[PDB]
Protein: Mitogen-activated protein kinase 14
Organism: Homo sapiens
Amino acid sequence: ERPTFYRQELNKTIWEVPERYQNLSPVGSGAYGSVCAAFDTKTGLRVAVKKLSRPFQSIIHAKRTYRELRLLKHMKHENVIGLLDVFTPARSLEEFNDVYLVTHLMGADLNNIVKCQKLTDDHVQFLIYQILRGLKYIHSADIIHRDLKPSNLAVNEDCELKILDFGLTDDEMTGYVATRWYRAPEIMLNWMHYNQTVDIWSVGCIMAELLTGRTLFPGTDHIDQLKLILRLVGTPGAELLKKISSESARNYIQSLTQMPKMNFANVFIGANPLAVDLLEKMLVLDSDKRITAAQALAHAYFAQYHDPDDEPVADPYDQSFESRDLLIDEWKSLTYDEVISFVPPPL
Ligand SMILES: Cc1ccc(C(=O)Nc2cccc(N3CCOCC3)c2)cc1-c1ccc2c(C3CCNCC3)noc2c1
């Protein structure tokens, strides 16, 4: 049965939501949507409700909407954001125009943690362990995050962590900006077809920052950031160079004065030697040679937390739609089907 909906205006946006959701309060806004904290009187949960902005305005938007809903419907893991509810006030496909996504409400992110709290090695162990546990799951579904950074990691009072994407442009990657500091170099400079290993670079950057309290590669721009990276990990060898399929990027990087990999024990002074070893295995320029999430979970750094019987993989995820070309109304109808077939988390 369809719940009763009620309307309010929230910062010149109409919100039409089921009665069960009360105390809506704006908490984040951007081009692709806006978010309210709410109270789900049905479950007694504090929730976030995201109203997608212009979900079907173009083929690109419509496909992105379908993409996010498919992803959130699939993700069922303790360290990965999941979907409590999805709804539309529309009574039919014909009048369908708005999509609302409901999740648990997150409190602090890892930026807040790193900026305000000081982290012991045990804290770093636990936090990184949970990122990798979540990544193992996400990667098993052949989902790449591509934008892992402290602001996309939510951490509760008990130091329990969830991976999400709060993403709501070339300009946005420009300059001295945290939007670029955690990106794998192959994606930052469009070196080649990239894959899930990009996320492991990001984890290396986050981990280093938990250990030092400071950004690892706070580049003032793409080139300055590359120079910071190469100063630490060394300039690429011939083997990696032949893998850089962009002939332009390859020729640029070859123009740089060769530099050796630095001693990581002298960069991360006082750090657990096992953390040093792990960082060396994550922060490898050749993405083919980076440690994977599944491999990293078995690294001795995580001995206290690693449980091979409680590090689950995802159910098969069909993303054949990614290579499909459809019209707006066809993406819209697929998205509609997914809204009406949603089944909330049990108990
Ligand atoms: C409501 C909502 C819906 C969807 C998403 C959301 O994370 N969507 C999304 C989109 C694309 C990719 C992924 N991935 C995550 C897992 O890794 C693979 C890729 C996830 C996120 C939220 C969301 C947004 C804001 C908040 C907040 C606020 C954050 C800002 N301050 C107050 C709380 N709490 O909880 C929230 C959930």
In short: Residues 91 and 105 are 27 Å apart (CA to CA). The chain has two domains: 1-107+314-343, 108-313.
